[PDB]
Every structure is written in C-alpha cells, then in structure tokens.
Amino acid sequence: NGYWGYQEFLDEFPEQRNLTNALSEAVRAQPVPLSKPTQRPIKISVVYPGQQVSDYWVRNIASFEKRLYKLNINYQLNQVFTRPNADIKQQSLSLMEALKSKSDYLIFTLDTTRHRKFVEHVLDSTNTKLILQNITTPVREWDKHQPFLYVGFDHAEGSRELATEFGKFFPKHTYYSVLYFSEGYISDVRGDTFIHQVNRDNNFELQSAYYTKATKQSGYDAAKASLAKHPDVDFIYACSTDVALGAVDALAELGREDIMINGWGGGSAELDAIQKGDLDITVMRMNDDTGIAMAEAIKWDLEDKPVPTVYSGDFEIVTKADSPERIEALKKRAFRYSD
Numbered sequence: 001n002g003y004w005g006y007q008e009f010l011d012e013f014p015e016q017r018n019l020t021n022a023l024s025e026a027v028r029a030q031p032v033p034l035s036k037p038t039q040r041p042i043k044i045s046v047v048y049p050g051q052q053v054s055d056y057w058v059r060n061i062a063s064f065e066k067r068l069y070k071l072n073i074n075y076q077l078n079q080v081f082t083r084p085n086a087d088i089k090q091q092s093l094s095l096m097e098a099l100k101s102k103s104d105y106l107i108f109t110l111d112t113t114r115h116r117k118f119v120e121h122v123l124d125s126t127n128t129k130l131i132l133q134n135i136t137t138p139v140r141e142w143d144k145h146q147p148f149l150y151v152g153f154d155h156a157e158g159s160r161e162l163a164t165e166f167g168k169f170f171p172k173h174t175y176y177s178v179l180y181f182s183e184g185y186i187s188d189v190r191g192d193t194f195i196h197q198v199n200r201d202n203n204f205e206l207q208s209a210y211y212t213k214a215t216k217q218s219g220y221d222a223a224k225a226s227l228a229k230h231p232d233v234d235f236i237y238a239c240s241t242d243v244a245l246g247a248v249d250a251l252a253e254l255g256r257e258d259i260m261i262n263g264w265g266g267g268s269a270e271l272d273a274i275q276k277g278d279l280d281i282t283v284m285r286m287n288d289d290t291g292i293a294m295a296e297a298i299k300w301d302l303e304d305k306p307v308p309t310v311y312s313g314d315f316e317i318v319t320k321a322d323s324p325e326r327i328e329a330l331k332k333r334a335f336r337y338s339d
C-alpha cells in the first residue's frame with residue numbers, strides 16, 4: 001500500500017525485470033572483476049541495527065566486503081551500529097550522522113511507513129547513492145527519484161511460503177496467535193500477509209495479535225501475555241527471529257509443546273533451534289546473495305552500467321524433519337561467503 005509488489009513492479013517495468021534478472025545472473029555467476037578503473041577508493045557508509053540474535057546484517061556486510069574484494073574494488077567502509085531498542089528518532093539521527101561523511105554509497109535500513117517522507121527528503125538532499133536494505137517493494141511516490149537500490153528477501157514471498165506450509169500442517173479453522181514485529185513496515189508485510197492468506201485460504205481463526213519491540217525479551221513477554229489471555233491455539237506465527245526465539249523460551253517455560261512456532265530468515269541461531277527441535281519450521285533465506293548483489297550493483301555503477309532498482313533473493317523452507325545433510329547443503333548455499 002503506497003508500495004509496489006516486487007513482482008508487480010518488475011511486471012510493470014520490463015527493462016527493470018531485465019536488469020534484475022541480469023543481476024541475479026551476475027550474483028549466481030563467478031566474480032568478474034571491475035572493467036573500469038577508479039581515480040580513488042570509494043567511500044561506503046553502513047548504518048545497521050546492532051546486537052540482534054539474527055546474523056543477517058553481519059553476514060550481509062561480510063559477504064558484501066568479500067565480493068568487493070573479489071571484484072577488485074577499492075573501498076573504505078564506515079560502519080555505524082544502532083544500540084537497542086533505538087527509537088526511530090535515534091536511528092534517523094545515526095542516519096543523518098552517516099550522511100555527513102559525504103560517502104559515495106550509503107547502505108541502511110529504516111522503517112519506511114513511519115518515516116516515508118523523511119527518507120524521501122534525504123533522497124532529494126544528497127548525491128550519496130542509497131541502498132535500502134530489508135525492503136524489496138519500491139515506494140510508488142518516489143518514481144521521480146528512486147534510490148540506487150532496494151535490496152533484500154521479499155517479505156511477502158517468505159510469508160506466503162510459511163502460510164502455505166501452515167495450511168499444510170493444520171485443519172480448516174485452526175486457532176492461532178501472531179507475534180508481530182514493532183508497529184511498522186515489517187509487521188505489515190510479514191504479518192498481515194500471512195494472516196490475510198491463512199484466513200482466506202484455510203479459514204484459520206486468529207485469537208490474538210501482539211506487537212513487540214522487536215527483541216528476544218519482548219518476544220518472550222508477548223508470548224507469555226498472549227498465551228495467558230489466549231491459552232488455546234495450535235500455533236503461533238512470529239514475524240522475526242528474535243521474537244521467535246523469545247517465544248520459544250516462553251513455550252518451554254509454560255510446558256506448551258502442543259504449540260507450533262516458526263522462525264523467519266533461517267540464520268544460524270534459527271537453524272540451531274530447528275536442529276534442537278525448539279523451532280518447528282522456518283523460511284530460510286539464501287543469505288549471502290544480497291550482500292553479493294550490492295557489490296555487483298556497485299561494480300556496474302562504476303562501469304557506468306544501468307542498475308536495477310530492486311533485487312530480491314530466494315528462500316527455501318526448512319522443517320525440523322529435514323536431514324542434517326540438507327541443512328548443511330543449504331548452509332553451503334546461503335553462507336557461501338560468510339560461512
């Protein structure tokens with residue numbers, strides 16, 4: 001809403017579908033170093049959220065840097081971390097701070113319904129080229145000047161896949177509860193998608209939905225509260241890794257192994273929980289592809305080639321029944337750079 005669907009957007013602009021497809025080919029393919037030399041090293045800023053159970057961000061940067069090295073790109077990387085739970089006001093402060101650096105590229109994430117126009121005005125202000133992480137759905141308003149790249153693993157797709165699995169695990173009319181992220185974009189695209197699908201297709205009944213602070217502790221708290229008010233459910237759908245892992249501790253504490261719970265993203269900690277059996281299911285994203293895509297995107301730009309506006313990587317579904325070999329194989333695929 002105010003957003004294009006990833007696939008919708010690629011349909012509407014064929015040239016974009018081409019560029020994105022070309023890029024995915026450039027990601028799958030072996031590194032091809034930089035065609036066009038530079039006058040100086042390029043300066044890149046990263047404003048990321050810190051201290052999360054989720055290893056997505058650190059892995060992203062890892063695979064990113066490794067790719068830039070492989071491409072023979074000479075970069076200087078200024079990192080900044082936001083402590084938690086950093087207010088959106090604080091995050092955007094960290095952001096303005098990173099803008100002073102007058103970098104060539106600026107990689108970051110910010111909730112883009114709660115700070116739509118802010119980011120728009122930032123886009124208008126600088127010559128720094130923006131990379132928006134963790135959003136794969138372009139904003140309609142910004143068709144005049146879109147950022148350099150939205151990069152991520154489509155939230156709607158991953159939530160569709162999970163909805164598809166839950167419809168597979170349970171009868172029509174099954175009771176469940178939902179643990180959202182914080183109020184915002186992510187909860188809208190991960191949560192409300194899942195709920196829409198599961199209500200329409202499987203006639204599931206949503207007992208309750210709770211917002212969180214996007215932290216493990218918060219996930220624990222919200223799970224406890226929710227199950228206190230609404231004990232009778234067959235699963236809980238969680239919108240992020242940290243919240244899921246908190247909810248697990250809650251379900252253990254409460255003795256509720258009659259309740260099923262999913263992860264989101266399938267990083268190391270989730271996979272470990274899946275192998276313990278603490279986590280019933282997850283949608284594991286092929287993590288490093290987006291780190292590698294950003295480096296390929298920068299390469300092109302420096303060769304003066306056109307760059308796609310968006311890139312989404314792919315998911316696989318992982319269940320606690322999967323073989324160690326399949327898990328291992330998927331790690332081989334997903335962390336092929338960050339290990």
Ligand SMILES: OC[C@]12OC[C@H](O)[C@H]1O[B-](O)(O)O2
Nearest residue numbers: 054056134239240241264265
């Ligand atoms: O992609 C990163 C992320 O999205 C929200 C949160 O920051 C992370 O937790 B997650 O569930 O692993 O996915």
